[PDB]
Structure 1
Amino acid sequence: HMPKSPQKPIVRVFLPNKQRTVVPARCGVTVRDSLKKALMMRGLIPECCAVYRIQDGEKKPIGWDTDISWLTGEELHVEVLENVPL
């Protein structure tokens, strides 16, 4: 056994209903494929969830299929497009 080793570059994603998670920013991997676990455990599909970052005080939208490496050290916030789960 060894202690935790988070010595990797990461991204801070805030999930709906006061939840949050941190994922390692890897080159080649998309934000979608990174947060797929977080979405799954929340029961949310990527197409019903919107992501944005804050730059110079402005909220700019982000595509799920963008490489998470582009967001190394960014704090993301998720929005629910349709709250009622069908």
Structure 2
Amino acid sequence: SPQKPIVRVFLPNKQRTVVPARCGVTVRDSLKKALMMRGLIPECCAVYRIQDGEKKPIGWDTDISWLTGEELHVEVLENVPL
């Protein structure tokens, strides 16, 4: 059976969108869909994932195919020009 890897990203506002683990693709591109589907932007959003009872912040250049099997969650970095 064709193996399907995904990462379930918990979007802002406690929603979630899953993105198929893209090999050779960064959190940037994968999450780019994730945010954009909600109408949000990866610019003012951060990627975190919970490890041993704690939080580990993720880098946008991180190959998302390592993060397969995990549930992610994005943290809104509110630094708007307001």
Q: TM-score range by the shorter chain?
A: 0.7 to 0.9
2:29 matches 1:33? yes
Q: CA deviation at 1:66?
A: 0.8
Deviation at 1:34, TM superposition (A): 1.0
State the distance in 2 between where 1:66 and 1:74 align: 14
- Runs of 5+ in structure 2 lacking a partner? none
CA contact (8 A) 2:18 2:34 kept: no
Residues 53 and 77, structure 1, Cα contact 8 Å, conserved in 2: yes
- Change in Cα spacing, 1:12 to 1:85, as seen in structure 2 (3 Å) is farther
Distance in 1 (alpha carbons) for counterparts of 2:52 and 2:16: 23
Distance 1:76 1:50 in 2: 10
Q: Is the 8 A contact 2:9 2:34 kept in 1?
A: no
Overall identity of the aligned pairs, in %: 100
The more displaced of 73-82 and 43-52 is: 43-52
User: Secondary structure in 1 aligned to 2:66?
Assistant: helix
Which one has the largest radius of gyration? 1
Residue-by-residue CA offset, 1:23-81 (whole Å, 9 max, x unaligned): 11122011111121222233322221111111111201001221101101111111111
Moved over 6 A (4+): none
Q: Specify every segment of 5 or more residues in structure 1 that has no aligned partner in the other structure, as ranges.
A: none
